[PDB]
Ligand binder design. Structure first.
Ligand code: HEC
Ligand code: HEC
Ligand code: K
Lengths: 100, 111
């Protein structure tokens, strides 16, 4: 994956994950907050634990990119809602919750 | 061995001192001075969190993006460019909020 380098927050995937330009219920952090572990609402909906080695080993990098594009269940589809370059940065954010 | 909560507490007065000045036309030399001191205090806080609080790689990059904007405020203050200080402070505020919303999602936090 193409590494996101720290920079201006208007270009950052964290600003998108934290809900810039999205309804709260369509923002990653609303379901995948508490550090990727899942919020109260996210756990009700069935989110996996992004900090978990076992979750991370269940997906390839390509599968994470394809997932963010397609959505699944209560996880929304984001194709056309952010650029392909941002989706790839976002896949890196998902990975980085388990990078210690 | 400071906790993240202690770092945030120690950053609040520098942040609120910065906020109080970004809405002025002013360029008091002492106020430009205090602004650089406030920016350095923030840089020091997020460096201490970034270094001594091992969470995960995202946590480190979030700290770095606060530092990116804090350093930019420092440079804009040194260049007597209040327009840029203002824009960078807004963007630093977002950077602070990004970490709060991602890691302390269900606690109401400032700013
Ligand atoms: C609640 C409305 C959610 C929002 C907003 C986001 N996600 Fe999600 N995610 C959610 C659920 C309930 C699940 C489980 C889906 C399933 O049935 O498996 C997921 C899953 C993921 C995954 C793992 C893919 C999988 O194994 O299914 C990823 C990588 C993921 N979600 C990423 C992600 C991103 C990047 C988001 C913001 C752009 C986002 N999610 C929002 C619930 C919700
Ligand atoms: C993640 C890398 C963070 C960055 C970037 C910023 N903060 Fe933070 N902060 C973070 C956490 C996980 C917490 C909760 C601490 C806890 O109680 O568990 C906080 C807390 C604060 C607080 C509250 C302090 C208190 O009295 O309880 C403040 C006032 C605060 N943070 C300020 C702040 C500012 C101004 C930031 C940008 C300059 C900033 N934080 C960035 C994690 C992170
Ligand atoms: K870093």
């Amino acid at each position: 994956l193409n590494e996101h380098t720290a920079g201006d927050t208007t270009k950052s995937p964290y600003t998108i994950y934290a809900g810039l330009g999205f309804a709260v219920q369509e923002s990653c952090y609303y379901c995948h907050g508490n550090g990727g572990k899942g919020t109260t609402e996210g756990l009700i909906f069935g989110v996996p634990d992004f900090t978990s080695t076992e979750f991370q080993s269940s997906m390839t990098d390509k599968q994470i990119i394809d997932h963010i594009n397609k959505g699944k269940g209560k996880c929304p589809s984001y194709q056309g809602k952010m650029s392909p370059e941002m989706i790839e940065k976002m896949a890196g954010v998902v990975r980085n919750f388990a990078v210690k | 061995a400071a906790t993240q909560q202690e770092i945030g507490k120690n950053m609040w007065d520098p942040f609120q001192s910065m906020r109080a000045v970004t809405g002025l036309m002013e360029l008091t030399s002492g106020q430009c001075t205090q602004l650089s001191k406030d920016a350095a205090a923030i840089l020091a806080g997020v460096k201490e969190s970034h270094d001594s609080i091992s969470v995960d790689k995202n946590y480190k990059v979030l700290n770095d993006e606060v530092a990116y904007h804090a350093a930019n405020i420092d440079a804009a203050a040194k260049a007597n460019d209040l327009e840029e200080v203002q824009v960078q402070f807004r963007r630093m505020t977002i950077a602070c909020r990004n970490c709060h919303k991602i890691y302390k999602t269900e606690q109401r936090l400032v700013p």
